Amino acid sequence: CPLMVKVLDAVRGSPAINVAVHVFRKAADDTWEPFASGKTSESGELHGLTTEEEFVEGIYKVEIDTKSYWKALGISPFHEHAEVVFTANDSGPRRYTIAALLSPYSYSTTAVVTNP
Template sequence: MAAVTEPGPLTTHVLNTADGIPAARMALSLHRLDSRLVVWNLLSVGTTNEDGRCPGLVSRQAFIPGMYKLRFETGSYWEELGCSCFHPYVEVVFTISDAEQRFHIPLLLSRFSYSTYRGS
């Protein structure tokens, strides 16, 4: 029997809405703001899988209240598909006050626009 692993407290899902497919193989990074020094600290880097998801962004222990950003390397993604785009990257900045909750940050993407929201 396979062990069941608990999903991380923060998940993302990137969808290429222009083509109606998951945005596979997109590089991204997670950062937390050090409010004393006012600098972003890199927590993790990853790449979306074939379903456009990037599991394991942050552990429950490292996920504390504060301001975070997910940076998606959209320009490189579109370039790999042989396309140009308007946004070379997308940064989604958000505040976590209750780190015991789960947070899902979807990114809906086309070459000239993007949308995001807090999912569940």
């Protein structure tokens, strides 16, 4: 996995399960092109989004569907989603973990970037 997404629920102290995630890549015409998508597992993690070959240099947007998550639990949250936008692989291939910690009116997001 060059790209992994991990989501935690700060209300429950648990992984955030079945959270939809959409990844986009900025295209040559400056539009966001769909890149990959999936749902977090029972561990809060989403693996297998992409491959080293496919995950070329670019500007990527990871959209985490936080509103849907909260609504399914009976909470009416503030944000529509969490968007994480970043340049990847500009100095060669890296491994990226995009973590998000969710509360109904607040979230944090962190990147952990390692060189394989």
